[PDB]
Amino acid sequence: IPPHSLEAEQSVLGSILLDSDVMDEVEGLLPSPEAFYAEAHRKIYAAMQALRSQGRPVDLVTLSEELSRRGQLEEVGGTAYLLQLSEATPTAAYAEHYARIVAEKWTLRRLIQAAGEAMRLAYEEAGSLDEILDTAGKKILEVALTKTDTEARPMRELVHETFEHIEAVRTGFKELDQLIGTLGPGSLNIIAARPAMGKTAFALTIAQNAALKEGVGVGIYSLEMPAAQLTLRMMCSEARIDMNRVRLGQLTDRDFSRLVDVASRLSEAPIYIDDTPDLTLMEVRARARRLVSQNQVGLIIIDYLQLMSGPNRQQEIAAISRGLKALARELGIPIIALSQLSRAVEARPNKRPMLSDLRESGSIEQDADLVMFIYRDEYYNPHSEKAGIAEIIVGKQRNGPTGTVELQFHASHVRFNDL
């Protein structure tokens, strides 16, 4: 008994016949013929597009020519139906309006199908519970995130959307951003370093710059430390208070209000932290979808990869990174995954990481769009003069070349600042 609007479909086709220039507008809201419920209208529309795909004016004459060629001129109702579409509407000025109706009715049908797909998957019982729930959620979430079902999208549709976007997440580090640009939609980004190098501190800075400055929602999978503590660290770091040394009864009335103010700014940030300790890939996916749909979220951080479970430790990690790459794509947002490195990195004179070091943790390099390492000279040389300086080595990216960019690191309250 599927939702549709025969009148709106007719008005759309009819108003295109009255003025083929509305086709611009209409194709925006109705990119794919599948939007049309009536088999007939779907054939008509597909032919009207091909006529634009050939650049020849779409009217009552050329449409019959194109249809009868393919053969459906009678299927669609003859040129008499075509005639009726013309007169059944007095203007072309409302094209957009009727298209919005047709577009919306389709989404409902699209949802009906996705839901029915989930329902059919549960009955079958083929595949583990995790796999069922994963596909069920992917289908449903696709209805809201993808504009069509079309397997291969036409360039015209694609160009329209990219151009629409260029008439209108960043790391926040001005010099790094120059080198790598933004962390693109649907990308896996990897921050890898030896433990205690400051990946988390680094990641949380990005999280704050994105959420507080750019105003983009950011979800954190804090697999290692509990949410409560991660929150204390952000407050205390910002407010310049070493919570590990300084006790409560040792706070000045001044710097106390100071962290209440730092706590005020943080409290308004759209940062969501999930600290469930031992998540599988499937679980992270399932949670991500719930998070992303309940909240405006443009960034996800996994801290850190090696603490995730499997359903060979290299192969589990490689299956995880692959699944995260997929997730990023499915949601159209960047995902940061933090990664630990082997002691292997340290068994050589030049103790700084390089892309090669990653093949030790499986085929992870292949699925990461960006790879950034963190090296500090203080880590392997208590004396050595590069104290306050930390270096971020872009091992792999697509917006520019490789390169080491340097930032300030104050070990005191564990922060990263521009140079």
Check if the beta carbon of residue 5 is closer than 8 Å to that of residue 99. no
Q: Which residues are catalytically annotated?
A: 224
* Residue 345 to residue 350: CA distance in whole angstroms: 9
Contacts of 68 (CB under 8 A, 6+ apart): none
What secondary structure letter does DSSP report for 309? Answer: B
* Residue 362 to residue 355: CA distance in whole angstroms: 12
Task: Indicate which technique resolved this structure.
Answer: X-ray
Q: β-strands 370-376, 389-396: how paired?
A: antiparallel
Q: Would you give the end-to-end CA distance of the chain in angstroms?
A: 64
* Residue 419 to residue 408: CA distance in whole angstroms: 6
DSSP 261-289: HHHHHHHTS-EEEE--TT-BHHHHHHHHH
CB neighbours (10 Å) of residue 264? 9
Check if the beta carbon of residue 361 is closer than 8 Å to that of residue 317. yes
Structural domains in the chain, sorted by start: 1-167 (1.10.860.10), 168-419 (3.40.50.300)
Which amino acid makes up residue 95? A
Residue that the structure tokens 């103010």 belong to: 261
> Does an H or E element contain 66, and which?
helix 60-70
Q: How far is CA 373 from the centre of its chain?
A: 22
Check if the beta carbon of residue 279 is closer than 8 Å to that of residue 221. yes
Cβ contacts of 247-256, under 8 Å, gap ≥ 24? none
Residue that the structure tokens 């292997």 belong to: 344
Q: What is the resolution of this structure in A?
A: 2.9
